[PDB]
Design a protein around this ligand. Structure first.
Ligand SMILES: *[C@@H]1O[C@H](CO)[C@@H](O[C@@H]2O[C@H](CO)[C@@H](O[C@@H]3O[C@H](CO[C@H]4O[C@H](CO)[C@@H](O)[C@H](O)[C@@H]4O)[C@@H](O)[C@H](O[C@H]4O[C@H](CO)[C@@H](O)[C@H](O)[C@@H]4O)[C@@H]3O)[C@H](O)[C@H]2NC(C)=O)[C@H](O)[C@H]1NC(C)=O
Lengths: 50, 51
């Protein structure tokens, strides 16, 4: 949903929501992957090569 | 796709799909109860009054 108020000098908040289509939380759960240092990557990963 | 299902159709479909095309998995309980919650995009005719 686009907040138009300050368009074209605007900033947006776009969601990406991922879930299992079949399984509930008791059957399949999620955790964030950890980096080479063991730090939780709780964000969209950005590889500079790609 | 492996089981009998009701053949639900959107009777007032305008130009989209008439029935479910996304055949997601069903949850089957030991009592024989089945829950099936497919997604769909419904394109339905609606008489628009523009007065
Ligand atoms: C970009 O968009 C995202 C998603 O919309 C925003 O993140 C959400 O922000 C809202 C606040 O605007 C968060 O909602 C708040 O969550 C607080 C924590 O409770 C939640 O988490 C616990 C975890 O155990 C749950 O049990 C609980 O049910 C909640 O899910 C609440 O304390 C806040 O309560 C306030 O609002 C409610 C009404 O909504 C009132 O009833 C309360 O009294 C109180 O005033 C609130 O619900 C939401 O959790 C965030 N989602 C996330 C982070 O995933 C970003 O903030 C946004 N970024 C921007 C705009 O910069």
């Amino acid at each position: 949903a686009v907040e138009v108020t300050y368009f074209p000098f605007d900033w947006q908040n776009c969601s990406l929501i991922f879930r299992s289509q079949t399984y509930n939380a008791e059957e399949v759960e999620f955790t964030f992957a950890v980096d080479n240092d063991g730090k939780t990557i709780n964000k969209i990963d950005i590889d500079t090569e790609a | 796709e492996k089981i009998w299902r009701p053949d639900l159709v959107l009777y007032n479909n305008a130009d989209g799909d008439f029935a479910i095309v996304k055949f997601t998995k069903v949850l089957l309980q030991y009592t024989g109860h089945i829950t099936w919650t497919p997604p769909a995009i419904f394109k339905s005719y609606c008489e628009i009054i523009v007065t």
